[PDB]
Amino acid sequence: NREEKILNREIGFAIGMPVCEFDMVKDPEVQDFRRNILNVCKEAVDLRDLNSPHSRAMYVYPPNVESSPELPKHIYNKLDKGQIIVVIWVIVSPNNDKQKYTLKINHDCVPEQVIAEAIRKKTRSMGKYILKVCGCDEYFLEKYPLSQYKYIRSCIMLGRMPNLMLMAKESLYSQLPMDCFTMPSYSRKSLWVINSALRIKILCATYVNVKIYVRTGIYHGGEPLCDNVNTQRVPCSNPRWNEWLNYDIYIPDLPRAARLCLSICSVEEHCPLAWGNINLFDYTDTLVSGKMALNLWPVPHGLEDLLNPIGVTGSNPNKETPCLELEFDWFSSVVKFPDMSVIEEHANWSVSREAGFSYSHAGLSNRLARDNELRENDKEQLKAISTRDPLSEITEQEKDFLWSHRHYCVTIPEILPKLLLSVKWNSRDEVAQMYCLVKDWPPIKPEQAMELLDCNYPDPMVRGFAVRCLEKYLTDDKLSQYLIQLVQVLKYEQYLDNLLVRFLLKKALTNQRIGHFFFWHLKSEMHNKTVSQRFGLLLESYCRACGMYLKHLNRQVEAMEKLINLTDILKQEKKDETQKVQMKFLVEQMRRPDFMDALQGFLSPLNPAHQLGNLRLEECRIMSSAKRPLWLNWENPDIMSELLFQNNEIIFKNGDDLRQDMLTLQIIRIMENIWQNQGLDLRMLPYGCLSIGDCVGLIEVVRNSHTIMQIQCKFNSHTLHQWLKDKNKGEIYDAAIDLFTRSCAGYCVATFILGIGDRHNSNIMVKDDGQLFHIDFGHFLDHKKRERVPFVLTQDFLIVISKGAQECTKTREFERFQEMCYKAYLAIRQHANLFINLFSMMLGSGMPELQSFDDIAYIRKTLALDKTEQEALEYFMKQMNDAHHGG
Ligand SMILES: CC(=O)N1CCN(c2cccc(-c3cc(-c4ccnn4C4CCOCC4)c4c(N)ncnn34)c2)CC1
């Protein structure tokens, strides 16, 4: 069709690859994913056309609301007896004359009441409307209490006056095109009865351009199901074997997520050359048989073991790589994994069998359950085990213990991860019973459920339960917050079509705020040939059904492409020139017709609520930094821009990997949020940062900020205190000292916990109002490979806290500061599992300082998790005492 070819061109531009390349893939899993995923697209469209135009408007402008209507105690204390002053703006006559109406209303007033009160005040000056945030495209389209909107909750917590704009419903509705989605043209046995041991034949290898052998292993996630089996040491000039390998496992005992993990190794001096993993079952539940070829992957930097089970599963798309040929066993017919009915029957047969076991029969195994023998000691031991962090070692005795008491475990549902790690995944009698307990398992918090999606949990039944917990209890706010982790754990799915991908895609196509960041996280990794087919196909499905937003995403993609091209020219053809010569070249290139239009009139990828109007060339700069970052400035075309910011500014940087910074910034926001609900107000600055491609992204501009260096220059340790004292003269002096010490306490604790790169005067920034914050988070955890203190409070910082006192280490102000630090540290300690899990979910991402569970072990040290709460406080204090050489 003409409309189809036009749409296919648009999708190609968005993903950065032509749709016709997907058509060419002869792999029934790829073509089935394309067809089958389309029902998620249909479902999402139906939900968006349910209550038109309002439900279309709710998709485009979802309420940016907090997870709970309940406001914290210290926040309410900022309100005039639970009441808020809000300003409502009405544009009257086509002259664009702005009229304001100041209202004093209850914090929990619904937008409809707020509107009625604004029209009363407008009428006293003598339902067909919606409220909009002044200066940006944020709307209050739903019946939430006003204080539940993040914008209002923020204005309350910052002692800022909210500015809302009354707008006719039909003015917004008319600006929402009806997007009628079209279905693309591509939309149109045996079982457990295999009485045999596992044997896989390794035939030969091609493209082996260097004696050598092939190492093999049967894995369930990163765990061996039997002993590893090596081939003979044949010479590399003739890599042939035709040798069958025998495994210590019965074919009916292979779990659903079992994989063959292999590598070509070179011999006392063992070293892996190329590696590759294969699923023993395909996406149809079929056990793989006969001849098959696998293109291997390059050994990653710092890979000690001969195998890579935690590595990507599938053939390398690059076919000019070592290609191992192998052959799997063939039986009577095609073998399939048994269905739930067969599994449920087997578990019930096993359960009933065990229930009739004599005292002495149960005595034969420590894994054997003893009915009505569960004492309160056993019950307390189980509770103690369940409160341990996810990285705590579960001993073999504890594993036998947990499994024998799996029926009591149902009563403490948060023990599910520990109990799942205690199962003998190579025992079908155990796994069948694990399934039936998972099928009826009480639901757990989405934060506990997220862990079950990491690399330690490959089983589909387990991942399905976790997805079900996200579907019932994960709010759109929390989904937005953990989207990066959720997108990463997709790479851990055995197959293209799964329940996690279906849930994410449904939410992306049902909420444009989610859809926006979902698109960008996927797109940013499209250069990675390990994920580009998975992420490309998911992008294609998203682009066919997101509606009008594809056209807006294309404006964003083109703008970024131009900025990448421009900065690639400045770095490779203007690198040695002066800033003046580079600026002249830049302003002449951005003025060109092949650039001017592509760089203005689009939505900010950092926050699509921000419209980027005309580019203000005279305000744009090439920043002094090494990677020649662009400080870009555009006019905000909003009618009421003057109430937020008249010019939207962003930093574009081409050269640095921004992925560790996004993770740290995300963790800073989560820490601040925990502290804020806990009652202790330590203001943090998790500025926006979005990786849009390979070492390329955006950084949010922080207005009225200066490095510690800039201050100390325009010496003495009282310079910083005097600068702040001068910037905040009069009664406002104390509010600035309180904000400095509070933000300072937050960063001391956050940076100590996370092991961030060493702090200096050009790494630390201060706002005019006293808010201190850190920049450049490219280094974290055990990156110095014994625990560091990256943020050392010098005399300058302590002199500010102690209000200019000489003996700042011995003041009331410093004792108050220390208490903020201990309270902050103990609050994070209480939420350790969350942080541990956020980090564990990012292990598959190629982050250089997050490669294994030993890198995450660093926060187990900084949070003194094996210790008691008081010994942990004493530990933190010693770390602070040692670094500062004082106390
Ligand atoms: C007005 C103007 O154009 N100016 C004055 C302010 N200048 C200035 C001076 C010192 C620091 C800065 C500076 C550095 C950073 C920052 C935070 C995280 N990363 N980075 C940058 C990103 C690019 O690569 C380097 C690190 C930021 C920021 N977010 N907002 C405002 N200023 N700012 C900015 C830059 C030039």
UniProtKB/Swiss-Prot annotation:
Outcome when changing I6N: In MCAP; increased phosphatidylinositol 3-kinase signaling; decreased interaction with p85 regulatory subunit; no effect on protein abundance
GO biological process: actin cytoskeleton organization; adipose tissue development; angiogenesis; anoikis; autosome genomic imprinting; cardiac muscle cell contraction; cardiac muscle contraction; cell migration
Outcome of substituting E393Q: Found in an endometrial carcinoma sample; uncertain significance
Keywords: Angiogenesis, ATP-binding, Disease variant, Kinase, Lipid metabolism, Nucleotide-binding, Phagocytosis, Proto-oncogene, Serine/threonine-protein kinase, Transferase
Keyword Transcription: no
Pfam families: PI3_PI4_kinase (PF00454), PI3K_C2 (PF00792), PI3K_p85B (PF02192), PI3K_rbd (PF00794), PI3Ka (PF00613)
Region (G-loop): 622-628
Result, substituting E393V: In BC; uncertain significance
Result of changing Y207C: Found in a cancer sample; uncertain significance
Matches recorded under Gene3D superfamilies: C2 domain, Phosphatidylinositol 3-/4-kinase, catalytic domain, Phosphatidylinositol 3-kinase Catalytic Subunit, Chain A, domain 1, Phosphatidylinositol 3-kinase Catalytic Subunit, Chain A, domain 4, Phosphatidylinositol 3-kinase, accessory domain (PIK)
Superkingdom of source: Eukaryota
Domain PI3K-RBD, first and last residues per copy: 81-168
Family from the record: Belongs to the PI3/PI4-kinase family.
Pathology noted in the entry: PIK3CA mutations are involved in various type of cancer. Most of the cancer-associated mutations are missense mutations and map to one of the three hotspots: Glu-393; Glu-396 and His-884. Mutated isoforms participate in cellular transformation and tumorigenesis induced by oncogenic receptor tyrosine kinases (RTKs) and HRAS/KRAS. Interaction with HRAS/KRAS is required for Ras-driven tumor formation. Mutations increasing the lipid kinase activity are required for oncogenic signaling. The protein kinase activity may not be required for tumorigenesis.
Subunit field text: Heterodimer of a catalytic subunit PIK3CA and a p85 regulatory subunit (PIK3R1, PIK3R2 or PIK3R3). Interacts with IRS1 in nuclear extracts. Interacts with RUFY3. Interacts with RASD2. Interacts with APPL1. Interacts with HRAS and KRAS. Interaction with HRAS/KRAS is required for PI3K pathway signaling and cell proliferation stimulated by EGF and FGF2. Interacts with FAM83B; activates the PI3K/AKT signaling cascade.
UniProt free text on domains: The PI3K-ABD domain and the PI3K-RBD domain interact with the PI3K/PI4K kinase domain. The C2 PI3K-type domain may facilitate the recruitment to the plasma membrane. The inhibitory interactions with PIK3R1 are mediated by the PI3K-ABD domain and the C2 PI3K-type domain with the iSH2 (inter-SH2) region of PIK3R1, and the C2 PI3K-type domain, the PI3K helical domain, and the PI3K/PI4K kinase domain with the nSH2 (N-terminal SH2) region of PIK3R1.
Additional free-text comment from the UniProt record: The avian sarcoma virus 16 genome encodes an oncogene derived from PIK3CA.
Protein name per the record: Phosphatidylinositol 4,5-bisphosphate 3-kinase catalytic subunit alpha isoform
Native source organism of the sequence: Homo sapiens
Gene name linked to the record: PIK3CA
